[PDB]
Curated annotation (Swiss-Prot), chain B:
Present with 7060 molecules/cell in log phase SD medium. It is found in: Cytoplasm; Nucleus. Belongs to the peptidase T1A family. The gene is PRE8. SUPFAM superfamilies: N-terminal nucleophile aminohydrolases (Ntn hydrolases). InterPro entries: Ntn_hydrolases_N (IPR029055), Proteasome_alpha (IPR050115), Proteasome_alpha-type (IPR023332), Proteasome_asu_N (IPR000426), Proteasome_sua/b (IPR001353). One of its GO terms (cellular component) is nucleus. It comes from the Eukaryota. This is Proteasome subunit alpha type-2. Pfam families: Proteasome (PF00227), Proteasome_A_N (PF10584). Keywords: Cytoplasm, Isopeptide bond, Nucleus, Proteasome, Ubl conjugation. Its main location: cytoplasm.
UniProtKB/Swiss-Prot annotation, chain D:
This is Probable proteasome subunit alpha type-7. It comes from the Eukaryota. The chain holds residues 7 to 248 of 288 of the full protein. The 26S proteasome consists of a 20S proteasome core and two 19S regulatory subunits. The 20S proteasome core is composed of 28 subunits that are arranged in four stacked rings, resulting in a barrel-shaped structure. The two end rings are each formed by seven alpha subunits, and the two central rings are each formed by seven beta subunits. The catalytic chamber with the active sites is on the inside of the barrel. The lineage of its organism: Eukaryota, Fungi, Dikarya, Ascomycota, Saccharomycotina. GO terms for cellular component: nucleus; proteasome complex; proteasome core complex, alpha-subunit complex; proteasome storage granule. The keyword Metal-binding does not apply. GO terms for biological process: proteasomal ubiquitin-independent protein catabolic process; proteasome-mediated ubiquitin-dependent protein catabolic process. Present with 12000 molecules/cell in log phase SD medium. Disulfide bonds: none annotated. GO terms for molecular function: mRNA binding.
Curated annotation (Swiss-Prot), chain F:
The modification Phosphoserine is found at S228. InterPro entries: Ntn_hydrolases_N, Proteasome_alpha, Proteasome_alpha-type, Proteasome_asu_N, Proteasome_sua/b, Proteasome_subunit_alpha6. Gene3D superfamilies: Glutamine Phosphoribosylpyrophosphate, subunit 1, domain 1. One of its GO terms (cellular component) is nucleus. There is a cross-link at K223 (Glycyl lysine isopeptide (Lys-Gly) (interchain with G-Cter in ubiquitin)). This is Proteasome subunit alpha type-1. PROSITE patterns: PROTEASOME_ALPHA_1, PROTEASOME_ALPHA_2. Pfam families: Proteasome, Proteasome_A_N. PANTHER family: PROTEASOME SUBUNIT ALPHA/BETA. The 26S proteasome consists of a 20S proteasome core and two 19S regulatory subunits. The 20S proteasome core is composed of 28 subunits that are arranged in four stacked rings, resulting in a barrel-shaped structure. The two end rings are each formed by seven alpha subunits, and the two central rings are each formed by seven beta subunits. The catalytic chamber with the active sites is on the inside of the barrel. Interacts with CIC1. It comes from Saccharomyces cerevisiae (strain ATCC 204508 / S288c). The gene is SCL1. Keywords: Acetylation, Cytoplasm, Isopeptide bond, Nucleus, Phosphoprotein, Proteasome, Ubl conjugation. GO terms for biological process: proteasomal ubiquitin-independent protein catabolic process; proteasome-mediated ubiquitin-dependent protein catabolic process.
Swiss-Prot record, chain H:
Coiled coil: none annotated. It is found in: Cytoplasm; Nucleus. SMART domains: Proteasome_A_N (SM00948). PANTHER family: PROTEASOME SUBUNIT ALPHA/BETA. PROSITE patterns: PROTEASOME_ALPHA_1 (PS00388), PROTEASOME_ALPHA_2 (PS51475). This is Proteasome subunit alpha type-3. Its main location: cytoplasm. It holds the Pfam family Proteasome_A_N. InterPro entries: Ntn_hydrolases_N, Proteasome_alpha, Proteasome_alpha-type, Proteasome_asu_N, Proteasome_bsu_CS, Proteasome_sua/b. It comes from Saccharomyces cerevisiae (strain ATCC 204508 / S288c). The gene is PRE9. Transmembrane segments: none annotated.
Length: 231, 249, 249, 242, 195, 242, 251, 244
């Protein structure tokens, strides 16, 4: 509490420090990797057990049958935004007879982050979401920050060891863009992505949780022994 | 967001309310004013002072009309005087002029304005009005009456009293010059003499604002042929009639 | 005492660690709870709690930590029980709401997630909706129950708004010492009565009192017979059949 | 110590909060606005900060109504909120009067809303400079709006990190043409002055985006510059810097 | 409306209420009471509208007893009467109309005199030596005036009231199957099973 | 107590630290004003200075027209100038609505004073940082000046100036009415009072002017107008030929 | 207002809940003891100050219902708010569910009421602890509950709150057996009076006693009766102490 | 913000006590002295004004004595400014009760209603408590004459004889020494006057600085004469007790 205070402070460095702090929420979270092609999106998520009598913590939430989100960070924070994205999608289905597109939903979300930074007694949400979908304009992968920035990427990560996933994806980038209508290949290259983002916790067929979306396939979540064909 | 709903007013640890002490100190930074209650009237007097000498003070007033029997005059903060005079008028009309059709008693009006000062001490988001007001008026049952509402929200009746920075001197003076028989004429020559000890600048009837809650005037009513509607007992005296009283000491 | 921090005038504020500070503080209040051990089998879930007493005057058979939420969902509460009084009431309302709407059982996970939604509501006035708590709760639950579509479940609900499915979980003061042993002794070959006795055996090690039936309490959830709280005499019987097996090692 | 709240005053006339908000905008990226005779040309620098990014699929230039471009720098989410408000305020005008909001009338709505957040302790001041203008029927206009809730007319305006350089090149261009230049011809000059304004900041690599509202080529609606025109403009600037 | 009569005896108020209850065109019940003891020494009987009567009658017992337990002393019948008046008064102005006609009878042990009151549905309090509402009232008001005396013993008040019952039965087209009798006196609030 | 200078509340001394700072934020821009009474007219000039070439000069103003016969000339910052401008326009319209004739100067002065008063008495309220001068020609009171200020106090005048160097201007007006022995300039042409005013402003500030360093407003009866830059230059050509 | 007045403390408490428990400790002492055919609440009447009329000063045991009495210790302002809220419930129960309250439902209500002012902000916690006693309707289980300002209720077979309460609790482990309560009103009363004569002292002045017998029998005992019991306890105690003393001498 | 500037004023200290109540009680001990003495025929409430001058009017002053209702008057000691809201709330409550039950208010009800108002301010809102201490004189059927004093917490206790404001402990001892259980209004007046003569900062106690009112069973069989005395009737009983 000097310049480092609540959501109202500047701060002679143009910052607000509430934003950097909520971005350590993400860092303290488990790793997740997204990657897309022009015909398929794939999210490959690392769940995290608390103990061996505890289960693994769901990391991927279905928003729609062509739209999905997967969180990284604080689970209570995620649940206020996840309810929100599904709510405006069903709203767009009702009113406009239309799927709520991924790019537009990034803009809606953006302003929802902004006003709890605007108002005193607010706080930024300490969750960053990766949001995939397939619409009438094709595949999109958005990376959402506690900042409120929405950005469009071919493949990204957030978590711990997020740097190691992006370096694998910088080499192999032009390979997965020209693989199209073969979802299998994209899934495996993302397994391979999250291999460089292990804390020696292993690749395991109940640690890794997949969800895909196609042109030709709904949103589907693979878990348990639906992941064994890659692993 | 907003949550000022908690008072900026608290009790100091040695007893009292801290802010009303600070506010009384601010009343000794203002102008000087006095009021004398005679047998046959009330006279009120104050000094006209202005920021720049090229300022027009004749188009400006520091004795204001609340109702046609009841006038006020201040010593203390200007901005705070101006707003509280308009509410005095708004509560006198809504709470006795719709409910009984006629202008309030002076005692009833003093309590109406003392609730406004109380609710500026109480409640969050506020501080007291930093003024001492004289509320002089006439009512039909306790005769002529003069009150002083202090920044606290108490009032006290007096027979003559003074306020502002020259208050100690002025009151010592009024202690011998008041009497159980007094004429309104004699009270006018008195009030000028005292307030002359309190003025250190120019001295003229253009600078001394005199109003009397004397006796009715049928000419300031604007109409005739009703004996039932009486004239205002207040009468602000134009500057020329005041310039005469300078010699009539 | 008086921890070195920068916030104690906010409640939804960060934190150079990057985690809510109040939430953090809450999990270090579950260790002032009394020890509740809970073993999940595939044949029932057993919830045992040390009731805790503090005088022998204290009548302790009219106090319990076991609360029936509905016929097929049990809960045992540990931590600060004034907070949990409000939490339990909320779930009971939801459970009945689902049976009104659909004339069907509520999922064990679906209910547990709902009381997590309640716990996220601390705040001065944030987000779109009103905040009707100022401060997060300091109580954690072992919601046992049985649903038709995943069988027997045991969940741990945190005052964080986060939930993990456990197959045995301990909460309270003696939580750490219990759970070490849970990691070691549990297998998926337990039955209803072997699990039952396994609760009183580890509950004896984290017993700071004396193991008897007036300070230890059992409860089961069985599919076709519902949630049934073991009477006190039957709990006495099990304590004795423990002593046969404790002089048989 | 006068940073407690945004309603406080300092004895040097300062209001520490608000001045610190300018530090936030200086970390932006170069953004220009060209007041031409026929209309306006906005351009924004879009950094490619990674090769994993999908180029020309993110906009930082969004229209408000159909004839007011708004291009912002500073805090990108915060500007998306200030742009979002002015679509509500703009549409209210059109309903109530059946005419699209005039550019000087729009200037007032936005200005007033930013000024408001320094009169209450309930909210935080916005840390953006927004640059907006377009063509109305009383002609083309340009405004630069401060995070202080202050604005003035401009014959050219700029913001960013390369703002010393931009504002400077823009004096040269108003000294080439005292009678001003075509918005047709301005497509190629926005390209030029963002490029010299990136020599300070040449650590990174960028994609040029340009937009215009002109009466002469886009019939007063604010459309994007695209196609062959866009890539010729890029080529123009490159030959100039070499 | 049905039977509901008061007579102010020297030392007591004798109230009586109809047994018969007809909602629809079939008598459904015929031993029901229409009276609820407010306080140890004030009884209130009611008739008026169906279903309005049962709810609003429970409402007054609740509130007057709320105040009784606050002050560990009981309100005078004059004071309870005024409360019932107050409420119904607000209710003819208010959105939903109540329509409850009440005889409040009590023995005040502090004025040492039995008190009888008639509160109509409009909201008019009146002290009376005998009273009645509705249909029954039209035949009895004149019948009680005839034979009365200022001071009459308790068992004389019963005999008179049974002349009024007996008369009613002949003349009314409605059937009421006899009354229930209650005495409110200085020695408490009792019933007489003799009809 | 400990806070009396970041919230509005009396000091130990009985003064308001917060409000004083508002009066110490009025000399930032460094605009000066001069206003004089004709016999049938009111004249006010204000400075217009732009620091760089790339501001368009037309939009840079300080003379803002509230009512049809009342002009309002603002000394202090341009964000709080716009909030004050807006507010008065709302009240002025409101007045016309409920009494049936367009708002007197006197009452418009009294109204903005009561709004200033509230901002120095509410905890979470930022005082206005402006002195407003209202110039009018009334039909009942004639040419008048009332000046409002952050305190919430107003005062009338023969003539007044504001700015950092205002003392020099006090001297010129004091001399002017020391010689005449009347309380206003006696001129029948609204133009030469604009001329007299400028002459005293050149004398007083010790500095030469141009059309663009001036900004001139005149209230005659039943209209308020501002002079354009062309019409301003002419007054300086008729000043030399006096 | 809506600002937090309770902020969770990192030592596993809330600061203001612990301050509230202290506000009862500096409060006046109540002793409550349940028999097997009565409940008895004895409460101290502070009468240190002279010239006080006790007839117009209320008692520190207040009957909520006609068969449920409540005594209290702690702050005497705040206590009156909990008691007005609890009388309102007592009637409500009759209105919507009929029958008078059971001891348990009310006890839970007072507990949730003090609980609301922690968890909510802008409302600070109370500092009052109650002994809630009575019999349920048509039963004769004497039920003695205690509520505390943390928002927790406990049943107890005998309980004490207020100043030097711990010293009284020590007495009750040895002089009241759980398995055998006293079996007469008169014995149970002489037991609680003896407890009051130790931490309040100064004759029968300060001693107030409410005795409840099943089925709506609440009576509060006259000064004269109290005067008889107190003087008997002192003489009986003098007679006993002295003969034990003698037997010690020789042995 | 707001959170920043908040002190917290309704919270506890480790004492389990509220500063703003003690601080209020302190400020009543700087004001004028107020005494009530209950006779078997009446109640005398006698109050000393903390200000006086030979230019103070006495003839429109009822700045400590105020009628709440025609059977209930109070003597006021504390912040006079605060008290005025509470007085008019008290008059309105009296009237509410009187409206709905058509019968004169008990003294018990009216003292408790005020105590709860004061209670509301310490309980919540972050407000300061009104700093007033009341002595209520009342007659009601049930208990006859009744005397009650209440303090800023919101707590009341009945009394036989009491003193509040400045010299609380001193005047009280005097009252213990000369109190007869039964008195006449004349014995109550005699005691009351002499105590305030023994506690005043001026060299002699004068009529021009005394407010004095009674409620007298000077009228009989369910009728009471309420009196607010004029200062010239106060002058006259001051020579009877021989002060003057």
């Amino acid at each position: 509490n000097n310049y480092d205070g609540d959501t109202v402070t500047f701060s002679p460095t143009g910052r607000l420090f509430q934003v950097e702090y909520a971005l350590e929420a993400i860092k303290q979270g488990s790793v997740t990797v997204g990657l897309r092609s022009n015909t398929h999106a794939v999210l490959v998520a690392l769940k995290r057990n608390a103990d061996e009598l505890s289960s693994y913590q769901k990391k991927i939430i279905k928003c729609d049958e062509h739209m999905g989100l997967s969180l990284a960070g604080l689970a209570p924070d995620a649940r206020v935004l996840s309810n929100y994205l599904r709510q405006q999608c069903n709203y767009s289905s009702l009113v406009f007879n239309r799927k709520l597109a991924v790019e537009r939903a990034g803009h809606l979300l953006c302003d929802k982050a902004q006003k709890n930074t605007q108002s005193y007694g607010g706080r930024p949400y300490g969750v960053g979401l990766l949001i995939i979908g397939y619409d009438k304009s094709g595949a999109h992968l958005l990376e959402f920050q506690p900042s409120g920035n929405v950005t469009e990427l071919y493949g990204t990560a957030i978590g711990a060891r997020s740097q190691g996933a992006k370096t694998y994806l910088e080499r192999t980038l032009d390979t997965f863009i020209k693989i199209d209508g073969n979802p299998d290949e994209l899934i495996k290259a993302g397994v391979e992505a999250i291999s460089q983002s292990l804390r020696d916790e292993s690749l395991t067929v109940d640690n890794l949780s997949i969800a895909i979306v196609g042109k030709d396939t709904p949103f589907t979540i693979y878990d348990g022994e639906a992941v064994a064909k890659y692993i | 967001t907003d949550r000022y709903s908690f008072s900026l007013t608290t009790f100091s640890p040695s007893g009292k309310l801290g802010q009303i002490d600070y506010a009384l100190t601010a009343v000794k930074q203002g102008v000087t004013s006095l009021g004398i209650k005679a047998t046959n009237g009330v006279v009120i007097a104050t000094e006209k002072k202005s920021s720049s000498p090229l300022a027009m003070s004749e188009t400006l007033s520091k004795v204001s009309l609340l109702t046609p029997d009841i006038g006020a005059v201040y010593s203390g903060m200007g901005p705070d005087y101006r707003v509280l005079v308009d509410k005095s008028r708004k509560v006198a009309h809504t709470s006795y002029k719709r409910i009984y059709g006629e202008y309030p008693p002076t005692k009833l009006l003093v309590s109406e304005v003392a609730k406004i000062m109380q609710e500026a001490t109480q409640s969050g988001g506020v501080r007291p009005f930093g003024v001492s007001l004289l509320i002089a008026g006439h009512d039909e049952f306790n005769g002529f009456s003069l009150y002083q509402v202090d920044p606290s929200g108490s009032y006290f009746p007096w027979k003559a009293t003074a306020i502002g920075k020259g208050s100690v001197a002025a009151k010592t003076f009024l202690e011998k010059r008041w009497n159980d028989e007094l004429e309104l004429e004699d009270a006018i020559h008195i009030a000028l003499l005292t307030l002359k000890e309190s003025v250190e600048g120019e001295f003229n009837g253009d600078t001394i604002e005199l109003a009397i809650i004397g006796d009715e005037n049928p000419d300031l009513l604007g109409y005739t042929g009703i004996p039932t509607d009486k004239g205002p007992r207040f009468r602000k005296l134009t500057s020329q009639e005041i310039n005469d009283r300078l010699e009539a000491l | 005492f008086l921890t070195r921090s920068e916030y104690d005038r906010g409640v939804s504020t960060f934190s150079p660690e990057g985690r809510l500070f109040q939430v953090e503080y809450s999990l270090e209040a579950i260790k002032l709870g009394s020890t509740a051990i809970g073993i999940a089998t595939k044949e029932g879930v057993v919830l045992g709690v040390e009731k805790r007493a503090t005088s022998p005057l204290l009548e302790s058979d009219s106090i319990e930590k076991i609360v029936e939420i509905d016929r097929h969902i049990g809960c045992a509460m540990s931590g600060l029980t004034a907070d949990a009084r409000s939490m339990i009431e909320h779930a009971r309302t939801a459970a009945v709401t689902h049976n009104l709407y659909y004339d069907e059982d509520i999922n064990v996970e679906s209910l547990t997630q709902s009381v997590c939604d309640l716990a996220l509501r601390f705040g001065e006035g944030a987000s779109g909706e009103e905040r009707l708590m100022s401060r997060p709760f300091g109580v954690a639950l072992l919601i046992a129950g049985h649903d038709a579509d995943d069988g027997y479940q045991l969940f741990h609900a945190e005052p964080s708004g986060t939930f993990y499915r456990y197959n045995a979980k301990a909460i309270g003061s003696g939580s750490e010492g219990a759970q070490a042993e849970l990691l070691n002794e549990w297998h998926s070959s337990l039955t209803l009565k072997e699990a039952e006795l396994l609760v009183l055996k580890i509950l004896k090690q984290v017993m700071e009192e004396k193991l008897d039936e007036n300070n230890a309490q059992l409860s089961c959830i069985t599919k076709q017979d519902g949630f049934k709280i073991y009477d006190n005499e039957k709990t006495a019987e099990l304590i004795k059949e423990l002593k046969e097996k404790e002089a048989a090692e | 110590g006068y940073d407690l709240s945004n309603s406080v005053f300092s004895p040097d006339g300062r209001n520490f909060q608000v001045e610190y908000a300018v530090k936030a905008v200086e970390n932006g990226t170069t953004s220009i606005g060209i007041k031409c005779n026929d209309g306006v040309v906005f351009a924004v620098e879009k950094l490619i900060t990674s090769k994993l990014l999908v180029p020309q699929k993110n906009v930082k230039i969004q229209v408000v109504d159909r004839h007011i471009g708004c291009v912002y720098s500073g805090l990108i989410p915060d500007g998306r909120h200030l742009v979002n408000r002015g679509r509500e305020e703009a549409a209210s005008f059109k309903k109530l009067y059946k005419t699209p909001i005039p550019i000087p009338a729009f200037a007032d709505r936005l200005g007033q809303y930013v000024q408001a957040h320094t009169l209450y302790n309930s909210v935080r001041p916005f840390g953006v400079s927004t640059i907006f203008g377009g063509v109305d029927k009383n002609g083309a206009h340009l405004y630069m709006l401060e995070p202080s809730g202050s604005y003035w007319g401009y014959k050219g305006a700029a913001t960013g990190k390369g703002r010393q350089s931009a504002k400077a090149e823009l004096e040269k261009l108003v000294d080439h043409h005292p009678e001003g230049l075509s918005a047709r011809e301005a497509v190629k000059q926005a390209a030029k002055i963002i490029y010299l304004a990136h020599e300070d900041n040449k650590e990174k690599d960028f994609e040029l985006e340009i937009s215009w509202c002109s009466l002469s080529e886009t019939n007063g609606l604010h459309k994007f510059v695209k196609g062959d025109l866009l890539q010729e403009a890029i080529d123009f600037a490159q030959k100039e810097i070499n | 409306m049905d039977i509901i009569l008061g007579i102010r005896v020297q030392d007591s108020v004798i109230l009586a209420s109809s047994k018969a209850v007809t909602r629809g065109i079939s008598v459904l019940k015929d031993s029901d009471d229409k009276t609820r003891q407010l306080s140890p020494h004030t009884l209130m009987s009611f008739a008026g509208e169906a279903g309005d009567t049962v709810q609003f009658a429970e409402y007054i017992q609740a509130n007057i007893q709320l105040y009784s337990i606050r002050e560990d002393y009981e309100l005078s019948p004059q004071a309870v009467s005024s409360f019932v008046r107050q409420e119904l008064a607000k209710s003819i102005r208010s959105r939903r109309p109540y329509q409850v006609n009440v005889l409040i009878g009590g023995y005040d042990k502090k004025k040492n005199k039995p008190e009888l009151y008639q509160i109509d549905y409009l909201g008019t309090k009146v002290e009376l030596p005998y009273g009645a509402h509705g249909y029954s009232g039209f035949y009895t008001f004149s019948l009680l005036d005839h034979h009365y005396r200022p001071d009459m013993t308790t068992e004389e008040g019963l005999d008179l009231l049974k002349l009024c019952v007996q008369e009613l039965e002949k003349r009314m087209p409605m059937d009421f199957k006899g009354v229930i009798v209650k005495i409110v006196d200085k020695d408490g609030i009792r019933q007489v099973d003799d009809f | 107590a400990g806070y009396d200078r970041h919230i509005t509340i009396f000091s130990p001394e009985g003064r308001l630290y917060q409000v004083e700072y508002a009066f110490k934020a009025t000399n930032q821009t460094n605009i000066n004003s001069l206003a004089v009474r004709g016999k049938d007219c009111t004249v006010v000039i204000s400075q217009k200075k732009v620091p760089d070439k790339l501001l368009d000069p037309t939009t840079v103003s300080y003379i803002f027209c509230i009512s049809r016969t009342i002009g309002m000339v603002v000394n202090g910052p341009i964000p709080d100038a716009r909030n004050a401008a807006l507010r008065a326009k709302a009240e002025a319209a409101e007045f016309r609505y409920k009494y049936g004739y367009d708002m007197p100067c006197d009452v418009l002065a009294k109204r903005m004073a009561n709004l200033s008063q509230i901002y120095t008495q509410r905890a979470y309220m930022r005082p206005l940082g402006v002195i407003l001068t209202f110039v009018s020609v009334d039909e009942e009171l004639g040419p008048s000046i009332y000046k409002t200020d952050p305190a919430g106090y107003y005062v009338g005048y023969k003539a007044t100036a504001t700015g950092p160097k205002q003392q020099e201007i006090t001297t010129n007006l004091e001399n002017h009415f020391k010689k005449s022995k009347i309380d206003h300039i006696n001129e029948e042409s609204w133009e030469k009072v604009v001329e007299f005013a400028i002459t005293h402003m050149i004398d007083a500030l010790g500095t030469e002017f141009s059309k663009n360093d001036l900004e001139v407003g005149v209230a005659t009866k039943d209209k308020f107008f501002t002079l354009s830059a062309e019409n301003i230059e002419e007054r300086l050509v008729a000043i030399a030929e006096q | 207002y809506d600002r937090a007045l309770s902020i969770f403390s990192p030592d596993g408490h809330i600061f203001q809940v612990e301050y509230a428990l202290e506000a009862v400790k500096r409060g006046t002492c109540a002793v409550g003891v349940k028999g097997k055919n009565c409940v008895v609440l004895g409460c101290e009447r502070r009468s240190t100050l002279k010239l006080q009329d006790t007839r117009i000063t209320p008692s520190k045991v207040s009957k909520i219902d006609s068969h449920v009495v409540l005594s209290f210790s702690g702050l005497n302002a705040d206590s009156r708010i909990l008691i007005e809220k609890a009388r309102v419930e007592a009637q409500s129960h009759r209105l919507t569910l009929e029958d008078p309250v059971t001891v348990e439902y009310l006890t839970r209500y007072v507990a949730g009421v003090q609980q609301r002012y922690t968890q909510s902000g802008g409302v600070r916690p109370f500092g009052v602890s109650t002994l809630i006693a009575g019999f349920d309707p048509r039963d004769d289980e004497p039920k003695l509950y205690q509520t505390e300002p943390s928002g927790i209720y406990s049943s107890w077979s005998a309980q004490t709150i207020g100043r030097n309460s711990k010293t009284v609790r020590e007495f009750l482990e040895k002089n009241y057996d759980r398995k055998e309560p006293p079996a007469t009103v008169e014995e149970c009363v002489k037991l609680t009076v003896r407890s009051l004569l130790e931490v309040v002292q100064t004759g029968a002045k300060n001693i107030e006693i409410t005795v409840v017998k099943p089925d709506s029998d609440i009576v509060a005992l006259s000064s004269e009766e109290i005067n008889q019991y107190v003087t008997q306890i002192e003489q009986e105690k003098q007679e006993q102490q002295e003969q034990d003393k003698k037997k010690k001498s020789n042995h | 913000g707001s959170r920043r500037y908040d002190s917290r004023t309704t919270i506890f200290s480790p004492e389990g006590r509220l500063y703003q109540v003690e601080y209020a009680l302190e400020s009543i001990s700087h004001a004028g002295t107020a005494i009530g003495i209950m006779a078997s025929d009446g109640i005398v409430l006698a109050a000393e004004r903390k200000v006086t001058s030979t230019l103070l009017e006495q003839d429109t002053s009822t700045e400590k004595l105020y009628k709440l209702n025609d059977k209930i008057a109070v003597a006021v000691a504390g912040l006079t400014a605060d008290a005025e809201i509470l007085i008019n709330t008290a008059r309105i409550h009296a009237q509410n009760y009187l409206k709905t039950y058509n019968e004169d208010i008990p003294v018990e009800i009216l003292v408790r209603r005020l105590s709860d108002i004061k209670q509301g301010y310490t309980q919540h809102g972050g407000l300061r408590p009104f700093g007033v201490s009341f002595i209520y004189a009342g007659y009601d059927d049930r208990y006859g004459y009744q005397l009650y004093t209440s303090n800023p917490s919101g707590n009341y206790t009945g009394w036989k004889a009491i003193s509040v404001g400045a010299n609380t402990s001193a005047a009280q001892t005097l009252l213990q020494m000369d109190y007869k259980d039964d008195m006449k209004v004349d014995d109550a007046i005699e005691l009351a006057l002499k105590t305030l003569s023994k506690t005043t900062d001026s060299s002699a106690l004068t009529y021009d600085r005394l407010e004095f009112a009674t409620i007298r069973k000077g009228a009989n069989d369910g009728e009471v004469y309420q009196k607010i005395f004029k200062p010239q009737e106060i002058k006259d009983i001051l020579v009877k007790t021989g002060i003057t």
